[PDB]
Symmetry: C5
Subunit: 320 residues, 5 copies
């Protein structure tokens, strides 16, 4: 008879998966949750959904599952499936997936003192508010919320593990990630019933360099072409074709931006404002060309276009 | 021996998951359902499908699961998995997903008086009739239906929880949400068999600002260019190229709208009507230019185009 | 002791889920199936797959599950999970999804006489042959097949419920739906082994109005422009640019149609034929323009183009 | 007491789902597998994945599950769920889906002699090598492999059912399907351990007619326009615009082909070669036009273009 | 009574699925893992995710499951479901899918000596760092990591099977695959707790030929057209239209590249740099043309363009 099998049989002789591990009803169970983010899978701005891959550390004491190590040949720790032992109900409150199931959560560690540890590796797809006021490059703070959904603070008191809680670098594909300090706070949706929760913040700064040559370069080139457009002679039979080419190009760029850029509700993106400015400027330039004393009007239009361009550039540097 | 484990064993000594919690066959079970919508995930107009993330509150009395709190060390409430206790069959009648399963519905609260509470967090993807008569910005009322699918009113009588039933703001990404008062009504698909149901209305008003610069700005610019087109001299060798550019631009815009706009059956969108108007106007302008006394005909065509444009603008303001 | 629990225990004292409810091997079990379609979710022509949301009514007699109502306090009907009682194996033979599972099929009704009823709400994604000979607007008959997959007629004899079998309107987004009468017929894949099946027909007529302005309007406008093209003077230095614009526009329309229209195998769509006609006509017009006594040749080409256009229009009205 | 229930209880009094139905360890179990393909769902060339809908016939003898029919009221055959009786492990070796589960495989037939039959309807999404050397229309042979994954030939000897094994037509949407004769062969990944497998071939010939007007018609029209291009006078101020239009059109066609055509590794498609040829020809024509004794050079260029076009046409007919 | 059934009953008389197969707590269990990759399904650069189809070989000794073959009629090996026998927890640490479940892992081999073998066929979708510094054709080394997630080295010591560990060819669709030697190394996330892991490297070199004609050919043709552009006479009334055509073509190519090319963060692709160079060159050429002693300036611009083109070509050959 194996000692480990005997210990497992004795420990779980009469155990249920729906009994809170507390010796008395008055007593409470302490659960420490640590959210570690390893890799940032992606962040869809159209859906405002951040997908990341990282494991979560759960630690809770248990008055049961306790044995003297010397009795069982000096055994220290054991591995037990999560199904049998009691499992605290911790769920991401801002979860976005249809179902919330850990990819690898079939094992947990039990010590002789009763400190039950769980490290279920999981893929977290959560919601995050994105501020797209400036979109050459942005940096948003996304908060992941953990805690019980039906256990009040009087039953389980979620906490944090201060050990090894120092800030450290997070691997990212095109986003530089900084791990913010985690905090805890209580929601109160009913009198005499407060539910604790842990909020962990992650600050992501965009580092992609392709967006500069896909969203800014064509727009600035179209603006430069529109600026050069008034220099064409009115009677050269080329202003109309040049304006048609500019309008087709800016329409194509607008279509590409609509296909790529999301439908932000708060504020229009700076790229969208630049595209609208180039659209209106090319339209007015085409109107002046088709209408065409004339030299002074053309000079005034060129000056207005130049001042608009310099204002746009200084604003871009201001939000750069 | 833990008191909680003893209470759980005694309560569920002989209990089935298919027995309605009623003391007599004549008696009925009252179930109160409250539908709370937290965030509006999205609303696809092409599929007419509204996806939202919100929890649902179920409250039903049970003659079983009753105990004296003083006996079990003054215990007040307990947490039990939904699998063991009886679960009322409440399903969204207008559900759109292949399967209807709550993301987090593995726990429920049982009080000493027997009032069983359930708060299964779920992601509801339902159907909603969308009126796209005016599409610069719309506001539709979407109704979510809850209730039993095989339990008649004689078995379970769905109701509403008037407590804290006041209207309140709902978080939204690009839609402003107002929570309508919920009502109840009975379907009758067979004589002597009426099934109750709860209908909750949500009024969503669009707040996206990008659609103005992606659907209206290019169309109005093309219309303005078409208006300016007749001013070109007939013999300037530029009307044909200008018309070709306009037709290419409007064709590209039509392609973009077809890729973006859904295939509405009721009425054509106002943007589609505007695009058709600009198409026909540019076509007739190109025909007049290629055909080209002439001055009076051109003036009449310009007047007709101007009156059409002013009628379109006044209609747009009317539905604005 | 609750009467309902006692009745449920007595009825299912020794019951299996793999035993056909028949008193003798010679006897057979009658199953009545009614397929009701509530909403037509969509119909993808590229995959030829029709997705609909509707419930299915199953009614089968059972010599077991029978009790005297007076004994159990006059109880009339009971609700039982589908897992315990025997379930006839009815599956859509033309099913297209990877798995065939009802969304809400966890409950069934049992009467005192033994008439077991089941109403599992389900989402049916089936195959349908689409005739795309005429595609301004079409109307196809799609057949849904129900029945056993391994139960022969000697075991289960599928039938129809003539009660309330009258034709009625079906809700649709962009398709008008008519419910055809359902029939039954027997497949014979082996001698002395015939399997019954129920075929229900649904006639869907397209009602979308956006396809007229996305598939027909640009094509007819390009055809009109090509018709007007020969009127341009040969020496005006504008025929070549006009032809280039027309060819670019028709190429863009062809790309849009390829992205939208499926790859039909039977016959080419009428829109595709119209696009091919406009392509060849614009190509020949460009060839004649570049080649350019000349007046008579141009008049003959214009006459041929006009007769081709009138033939196309009369054919379109014929299939309209 | 029902006779069928008594027979089912007696047959499965002590039965396991992990015991091979063999009376002795030396003896082996014969399994006959027949792969029948009903409909070809699709064949994605980009992923090289063929999805089809067809049922599979399994027949294996069992020394258990045997009874005298006369004892049980002359019962002949019974239906039993696949979970209880032993199930041979037959899996498509070239399966492409994440999971391999039959859609409807919950029932099987047991005869009095012990011949266990199984007809699990399934949707097979397998891999197939596609030869895209000629892509106006192709015809590939796709092989589906069935057999055990951990059972050697010494345990289960897969075979074929020669009865009704004649070639017959297979329904297809846009592919004509011919059922090839199935064969068996043994893999040997370890000495003294050979695993049998059944390979069934299906020959599919493309029948789509839309690809001719979406991939060949625009290319041939662009080639014809490029051929006509040299006839334009050098000083007509139209060669440059015509070349620009041709290059824009061929670029759009290349974009469409890239979006549609997959990234074949073996050989470039014939359509891609034709597009490259038209690209290079239009580029050289534009270079000659911009550079522009001249008449002889233009005649030589026209002759070279004509000979290249005739070579391309004869090659196309050769692979046609 | 079948001998095999008796052996299976005797072996698993009292066995648990959560007991490590070790005779003593001090002793450890050796597990040998071999990762074999058969086919490379694909490698998405946008997500940096490599999907492959290959089986994994697990071999672990067991002090239990041991019997004398002579007793049970000389039986050598048996097949047992993975559910009953103990299963080592081996999971891909860099897994990308939501869930990690083997497609076919329902069987395992048990020998008389106790050497338990498992060959669960699986589809591995892992993460891989992609170096896109040069993108005419690349070759990346992707590492797959296997090992325990909660078992330390003191419990299970993962190793490698040196038998038949020679390098061999791997089938690929458009990637040539070389199998690198596998190694083992230990992670240490806590003192006195080291977890072993096996890293297997696969070197993939791109072999697709379509990317040359979709990403390089249009870019080089546009560059050649831009080079030829300065040769146009300033007063020919064709420089403006030629520049408009070039800018439209390069904008379309940029849109296609943005739709196809991923958003790399490390370095911009060489194709993107080439497109930016052609954009800036065509813009400056258009500026010089519109501005237009002049001959010397045009010659200097042509020389600068030629030297830039030759530098780009020599760099491309350097990274070719
Ligand atoms: C609803 C949950 C509260 C969960 C909790 O931890 N405790 C109370 C739960 C009580 N129950 C519902 C179980 C019982 C109800 C009893 S009742 O009487 O109602 O039936 C809270 C916790 C975190 C909250 C938000 C995120 O942070 C950030 C975010 C940014 C936005 O711009 C708006 C959207 C969003 C996603 C917010 C939505 C919502 O606000 C959340 C999910
Ligand atoms: C069919 C269900 C009724 C469910 C119910 O709550 N009670 C009766 C069910 C009785 N069973 C079927 C179980 C037994 C049949 C016995 S039988 O004798 O038939 O076999 C009812 C309840 C809500 C209804 C609609 C939505 O509101 C709004 C909506 C807008 C449209 O523009 C048309 C589409 C849509 C989705 C409507 C469809 C349908 O109309 C629904 C789903
Ligand atoms: C294959 C099933 C028959 C199912 C049935 O109801 N009864 C016999 C089954 C017998 N089993 C296979 C179980 C045992 C074989 C014994 S064996 O000796 O073979 O091993 C029959 C029933 C309905 C049939 C079609 C649809 O209507 C319409 C349709 C339009 C097309 O243009 C071609 C495609 C399609 C989808 C057709 C395919 C096929 O034709 C179907 C699925
Ligand atoms: C790997 C399986 C063999 C399965 C089998 O039926 N028997 C041996 C299995 C032995 N096990 C792995 C279970 C134990 C290993 C013991 S070990 O000592 O290794 O640990 C064989 C059977 C069929 C084979 C291919 C297809 O036909 C056609 C195809 C066309 C291509 O262009 C290249 C890709 C592809 C998909 C091929 C891949 C592979 O080649 C397959 C899946
Ligand atoms: C996190 C795992 C370690 C797993 C392991 O094998 N052993 C330790 C696990 C210990 N647990 C978490 C279970 C307990 C924690 C105790 S605690 O006290 O924290 O609660 C390690 C093993 C392999 C690692 C990477 C890949 O190779 C390559 C790769 C390329 C990039 O450019 C950055 C991204 C990426 C995907 C890396 C991420 C991460 O780095 C991985 C997944
Ligand atoms: C919960 O734990 C926190 C420690 O962060 C402590 O401050 C608080 O008093 C605890 N509350 C209860 C009810 O135990
Ligand atoms: C159901 O509850 C409602 C309360 O909203 C009540 O008006 C109605 O009479 C009840 N019906 C039955 C049958 O209990
Ligand atoms: C099956 O039911 C039909 C009723 O539609 C009947 O005509 C037929 O005779 C029945 N067949 C058997 C074998 O019971
Ligand atoms: C397996 O069956 C085939 C029949 O196709 C037979 O030729 C072969 O000898 C059999 N092998 C064994 C080991 O039974
Ligand atoms: C684990 O196995 C390796 C063999 O690769 C061996 O070198 C090492 O010492 C072993 N460690 C333990 C703790 O058994
Ligand atoms: Na043009
Ligand atoms: Na164009």
């Amino acid at each position: 008879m194996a000692d480990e099998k005997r210990l497992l049989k004795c420990i779980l002789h009469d155990y249920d998966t729906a009994i809170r591990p507390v010796q008395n009803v008055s007593d409470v169970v302490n659960v420490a949750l640590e959210v570690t983010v390893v890799k940032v899978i992606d962040l869809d701005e159209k859906e405002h959904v951040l997908t990341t891959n990282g494991w979560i550390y759960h630690e809770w004491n248990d008055f049961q599952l306790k044995w003297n190590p010397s009795d069982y040949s000096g055994l220290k720790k054991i591995r037990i499936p999560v199904d049998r032992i009691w499992t605290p109900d911790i769920v991401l409150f801002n979860n976005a997936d249809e179902s919330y199931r850990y990819v690898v959560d079939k094992l947990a560690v039990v010590y002789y003192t009763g400190k039950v540890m769980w490290v279920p590796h999981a893929r977290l797809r959560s919601f995050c508010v994105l501020d797209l006021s400036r979109f050459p490059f942005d940096s948003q703070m996304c908060t992941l919320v953990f805690g019980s959904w039906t256990h009040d603070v009087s039953s389980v008191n979620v906490t944090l593990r201060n050990q090894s809680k120092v800030q450290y670098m997070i691997d990212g594909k095109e986003w530089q990630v900084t791990s913010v300090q985690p905090k805890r706070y209580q929601w109160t949706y009913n009198s005499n019933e407060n539910y604790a929760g842990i909020i962990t913040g992650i600050k992501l700064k965009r580092t992609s360099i392709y967006y500069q040559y896909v969203f800014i370069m064509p727009t600035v080139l179209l603006a430069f072409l529109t600026l050069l457009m008034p220099f064409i002679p009115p009677l050269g039979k080329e202003r109309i074709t040049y304006g048609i080419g500019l309008v087709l190009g800016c329409t194509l760029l607008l279509m590409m931006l609509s296909d790529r850029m999301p439908t932000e509700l708060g504020n229009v993106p700076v790229v969208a404002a630049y595209l609208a400015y180039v659209f209106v400027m090319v339209a007015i330039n085409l109107l002046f060309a088709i209408m065409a004393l004339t030299r002074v009007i053309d000079r005034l239009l060129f000056g207005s276009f130049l001042v608009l361009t310099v204002v746009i550039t200084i604003s871009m540097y201001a939000h750069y």
